[PDB]
Amino acid sequence: NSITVRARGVNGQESVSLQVGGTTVQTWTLTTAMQDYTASTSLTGEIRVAFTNDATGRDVQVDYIVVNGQTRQAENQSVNTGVWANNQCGGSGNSEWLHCNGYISFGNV
Numbered sequence: 001n002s003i004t005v006r007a008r009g010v011n012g013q014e015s016v017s018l019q020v021g022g023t024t025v026q027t028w029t030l031t032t033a034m035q036d037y038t039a040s041t042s043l044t045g046e047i048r049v050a051f052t053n054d055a056t057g058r059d060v061q062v063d064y065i066v067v068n069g070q071t072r073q074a075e076n077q078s079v080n081t082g083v084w085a086n087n088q089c090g091g092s093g094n095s096e097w098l099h100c101n102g103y104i105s106f107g108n109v
């Protein structure tokens, strides 16, 4: 099961973890350019991309992921617990942004 994450940070210290069924597959430190990050698992289950090290000046943007060849846009996902929206952390879904610690759920593998 191949999973590619296309993502960037605002300052390049930002850390994201790819999780599958509650298991952490891989963790990466992002750069300020949108770039691809790839991982693989034999596991199935819910995919999450989690921003874990929010601090003054850090924000994550996930464009999309690609799961076994199939594109899933971050902005088409309904659960986003880190976006700043409606004047609060995790204030909406359907966003590329994780401003606060939180994750975007991309559903089952």
Ligand SMILES: OC[C@H]1O[C@@H](O[C@@H]2[C@H](O)[C@@H](O)[C@H](O)O[C@@H]2CO)[C@H](O)[C@@H](O)[C@H]1O
Pocket: 054, 055, 056, 057, 058, 059, 084, 099, 100
């Ligand atoms: O509430 C603390 C929270 O704020 C975040 O920033 C939001 C928003 O993302 C910015 O665009 C806006 O300029 O400022 C607000 C808060 O005033 C932030 O990204 C988080 O890391 C938290 O600190």
Ligand SMILES: [Ca+2]
Pocket: 062, 063, 064, 073, 074, 075, 096
């Ligand atoms: Ca996108």
Ligand SMILES: [Ca+2]
Pocket: 054, 055, 057, 058, 059, 098, 099, 100
């Ligand atoms: Ca932030």
